[PDB]
């Protein structure tokens, strides 16, 4: 399986972290940094943030069916809007690809890890 079992591993670990996103400083900051760096969000796509109890699309509060602000296009001269990701999951990618990163983080992280291995050895 090689790559495929790797995708399974990564998706499983980041879904687990998302489900406990607000209990883990380590994972919280890890996910925040990864998303802000690779301009990505989640596993297969940003929809994964729906499995967090606060961001589920049938949740009561306003964090429902939205995505944490680290998935917005942070590389702008603008200041941080915490609510930039709200109410974006029920809508299909191209509506919000101007507002948030839509690709998942698994694939982007793995393609970077591959193409930047020439320096990793020696």
């Amino acid at each position, epitope marked *: 399986t090689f790559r495929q079992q790797t995708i399974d591993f990564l998706n499983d670990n980041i879904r687990r972290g998302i489900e406990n996103y607000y209990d883990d400083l380590d994972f919280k900051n890890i996910m925040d940094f990864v998303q802000k760096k690779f301009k990505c969000c989640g596993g*297969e796509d940003y929809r994964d943030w729906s499995k967090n109890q606060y961001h589920d699309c049938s949740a009561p509060g306003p964090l429902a069916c939205g995505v944490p602000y680290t998935c917005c296009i942070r590389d702008t001269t603008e200041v941080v809007n915490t609510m930039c990701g709200y109410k974006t999951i029920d809508k299909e990618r191209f509506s919000v690809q101007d507002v948030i990163y839509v690709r998942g983080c698994t694939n982007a992280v793995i393609i970077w890890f591959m193409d930047n291995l020439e320096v990793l050895f020696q």
Partner: antibody
Amino acid sequence: QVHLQQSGPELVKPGASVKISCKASGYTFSDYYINWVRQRPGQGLEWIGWIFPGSGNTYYNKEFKVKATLTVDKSSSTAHMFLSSLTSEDSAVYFCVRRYDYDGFAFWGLGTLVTVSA
Amino acid sequence: DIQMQQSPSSLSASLGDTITITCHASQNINAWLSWYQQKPGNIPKLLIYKASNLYTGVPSRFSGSGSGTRFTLTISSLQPEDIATYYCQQGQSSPYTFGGGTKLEIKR
């Protein structure tokens, strides 16, 4: 060639159940949502709920959560809406729709007419 | 919890004239809003998406704009084939809701 074909019109006795099927074509099925909308014969459009095939997640309007259940079969590239405990009011036309790459509902099904009648 | 209200319950005006329909929201929905047209004896077609933009294939005489709470769809140089019933929906927060439906009649 983005098209949605629904089931043929259905007739059911009161209290029975119906399975409406919606086959999609022209686009990657798993990537886009499917919405369902019901129009009673003499009224406007009324919103059932949404379902995303790639994850299987579902959201319902509160009114229809009891009476309807939404499913998908990715291999068929088809969505289904199952209605149960049908009332004399539930006789209506049901549409399955796929929205445009931007927010609007671009592609509407022709409509499946379900008549609850003895 | 987000209910739509359409202003002209039934509105008839003459050809060539400019008419306007209003769609008021219960809560701020920013720009997430859509307009559809339903010719009688026909399935609905998409008319306007995202408040301002027009869906492909719509004649340019249709225009729409507004802000969060209140929106307007305006038809200039009205034509007979535009006899239909017109609807608006919101999409910001699920569950999506529709409008009351506004009937359009020509005066001839």
